[PDB]
Amino acid sequence: AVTGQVDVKLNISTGCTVGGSQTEGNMNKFGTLNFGKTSGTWNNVLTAEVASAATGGNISVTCDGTDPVDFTVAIDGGERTDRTLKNTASADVVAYNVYRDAARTNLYVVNQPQQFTTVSGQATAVPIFGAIAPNTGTPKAQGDYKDTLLVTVNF
Amino acid sequence: AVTGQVDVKLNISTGCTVGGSQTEGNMNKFGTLNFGKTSGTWNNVLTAEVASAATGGNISVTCDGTDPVDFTVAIDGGERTDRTLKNTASADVVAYNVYRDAARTNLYVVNQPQQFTTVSGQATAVPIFGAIAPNTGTPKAQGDYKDTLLVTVNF
Amino acid sequence: AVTGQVDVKLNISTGCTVGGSQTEGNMNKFGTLNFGKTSGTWNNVLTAEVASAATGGNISVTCDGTDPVDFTVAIDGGERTDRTLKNTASADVVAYNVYRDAARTNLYVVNQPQQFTTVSGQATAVPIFGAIAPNTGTPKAQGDYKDTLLVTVNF
Amino acid sequence: AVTGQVDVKLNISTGCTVGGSQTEGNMNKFGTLNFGKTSGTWNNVLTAEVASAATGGNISVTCDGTDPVDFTVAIDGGERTDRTLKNTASADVVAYNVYRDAARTNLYVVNQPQQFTTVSGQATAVPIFGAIAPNTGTPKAQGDYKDTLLVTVNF
Known part of the structure; x- marks a missing residue:
């Protein structure tokens, strides 16, 4: 019997909110x-951009404040922690990656706070640009490949 | 700390591919x-046609299938979203537009899926015809003007 | 082409000057x-008094003359003409008013010459007493609220 | 015509409020x-304590916050600026003073921020202890003597 404590905390004062999301x-x-x-x-x-579940466009993060706020964005490695989509039925995998800029250069490194700015009376967009390498070796099995990346907007 | 989910998907079954491109x-x-x-x-x-980076000719999109496939083509508004080329050093801009037909009439409207057909055993060309209005007012500064239009072949 | 005339005038003879100001x-x-x-x-x-930018105390108007001079004081309605402070980022407004006496009774009515006296060898103070009504309804957004009242010392 | 600017400001974020007052x-x-x-x-x-107009007891200042807040209290010199009560009809005056502690020692000096503390979930009282010197010289005229001290709770 190893009983232990977990301190829970929340600082209600002046925070930032993420728009474009739907509460599943x-x-x-x-x-x-x-x-x-x-x-x-x-x-x-293969290349596509994130489509917000609420509007259809890009995730629009706005901060509830007047002065500029510097908030960070971190994306994790997916269900299996190596950014691979898995076939719903078979065990085939499809490696991918999410970048921040339009030219697939600034990568959202696994568990890293890619910095972001937000200004007075405005909603800043969070571009999550997906990209998949050219597979010209083995043909992956037919079906639907999926993954659930957890995006972590933190301050 | 606003943690959220981003569902990633890919349907490997029977798709269409774009030829004439080089992986930068x-x-x-x-x-x-x-x-x-x-x-x-x-x-x-001033008027010029797109020259594919792989061959030098027009982008040749072919579909990996037997029956005819109807694929769409969408071009965005460029780096600044208003189809303007920018001087590498100064802030001068040069407004332009991309059309689909040879007579500069059918405009590739910003973020719009201009329809296209593709048939059995064939590669269809994607004519991206550029066109710039006659500037007979102010002489833009010397140098090189650039822009990077993102063409979006989507299904 | 409607060209018109604007007569400019200035009577340099024996005037009155306002102290406590800084030339911005x-x-x-x-x-x-x-x-x-x-x-x-x-x-x-919420209630506070004007603090002169030059000294920190009250605006001290003195008249350059020997006999008593009766000068007037007029304050306008602020940036939006309805005496409301505006949040720097959001569009929230905070209604206020400026009074002349210490008991918040004699209001400096919008664009009105509230009379004043000035005597031999003395500087008279211009009390601009601010006052804001109790807001016990909706909580205005966080941040800084501002306004720029133009005070018009005229003769 | 000397027109000038008066910047108005208000920082709506996390403030302190004074209880025991009534809006006259x-x-x-x-x-x-x-x-x-x-x-x-x-x-x-002659010695008496301030009686709040709202409750009848002492002014109870509470701060709308969690962490302790250090607020100040400043009292001015009265209507004539020398802490004298004036007879409603005649010109007789009665000099007095307001102290902070029960033993009439810590004087609320004219236009001075006598410091104060306020803590979590509590209302701190503002003792304004009045005191009048023994007049054993001239008998002041009959009637009612008054004064209106402006107490300035500022941060």
């Missing part, structure tokens, strides 16, 4: 990274 | 819209 | 009406 | 310092 039960549904349909072996880098 | 790092380099050299004030509409 | 560029900075810090919903009437 | 029109009525009845020449120091 008790977990915020931020959006979808829909690469679309594809064949077994694709030569072009 | 992790972003597909589709081509170049080279208007060429010009003077400060041009009276003629 | 080409506009006389008379002072500050600092109500201080407050919570979303205040039950007490 | 647009001016907070804090209380009454009632020395009571007296004869022309009194040998004993």
Whole structure:
């Protein structure tokens, strides 16, 4: 019998809120990274942007304050922690990655706070740009591949 | 701490691929819209066609299927979202537009899926015809003007 | 082309001057009406006096003459013309008013010359007493609320 | 025509409020310092405490916050600026003073911020102890003597 304590805390004072999300039960549904349909072996880098579940556009984070606030954005490694989509039925995997800029260069490194700014009376967008490498080796099995990345807007 | 979910998806079954592109790092380099050299004030509409980065000709989209597939083409508004080329050093801008037909009539409207057909055993070309209005007012500063339009072949 | 005339005039002879002001560029900075810090919903009437920008005390108007001079004081309605402070970022407003006497009774009516006396070898103070009504309804958003009342010492 | 600017400000964020007051029109009525009845020449120091206009007891200042807040209290010199009560009809004056502690030692010096503490979930009382010197010289005229001290709770 090892009984222990867990201090719970919350500082209600002046915070920042994330728009574009829908409450799926008790977990915020931020959006979808829909690469679309594809064949077994694709030569072009499959690429799609996150579509917020609430509006359809990009996640719009706004801060409830007057002065500028510097908030951070961190995305985790997905269900299996290595950013791989898994086929619903078979065990095939599809490696992918999420970048922050339009040219697939600034990668949202696993469990890292990619910095962000937010200004007076405005909603800043959180671009989560997906990208998949060209698979020109083995044709992955037919079906639907999925993953649930947990995006962590933290301060 | 606002943690949220982003569902990632990919339907590997029977897709369409875009030829004529080169993988620039992790972003597909589709081509170049080279208007060429010009003077400060041009009276003629400057006009050039996209040159695929892989072959030099037009982007050739082919679909990996037997039955005809109807795929769409969407081009965005460029780096600044208003189709303006920017001088590398100064802040001068050069407004332009991309059309689909040879007579500069069917405009690729910003973020719009201009429809396209593709047939059995064939590669369909994606004509991205550039066009710039005659500037007979103020002479833009010397140098190189650039823009990076993101073409979005989606299904 | 409607060209018209604007007669400019100035009577240099024997005038009155306002002390306690600092020249902000080409506009006389008379002072500050600092109500201080407050919570979303205040039950007490928030009340503060003008603090001259030059000395810190009350605006001291003196007249350059020997015989008594009767000069007037007029304050306008603020930036939006209805005496409301505006949040720097959001569009929330905070209604207020400026009175002349210590008991918040003699109101400086919008664009009205509240009379004043000035005597031999003396500086008369211009009490601009601010007052804000008790807001016990809706909590205004966090941040800084501002307004710039133009005080018009005229003869 | 000397037109000038008066910057108005208010920081709505997390403030402190004063209880025990009643809004007399647009001016907070804090209380009454009632020395009571007296004869022309009194040998004993006349002494009474402030009675809040809202409850009848002492002014109870509470701060709308969790952590302790250090607020200040400043009282001015009365209507004539020398702490003298004036007869309603005649010009006789009665010098007095307001102290902070029960032994008439810690004087609320004119226009001075006598410091104060306020703690979690509590209302701190503001003791305004009045005191009048023994007049054993000239008998002041009959009638009612009054004064209106402006108490300034500031942060």
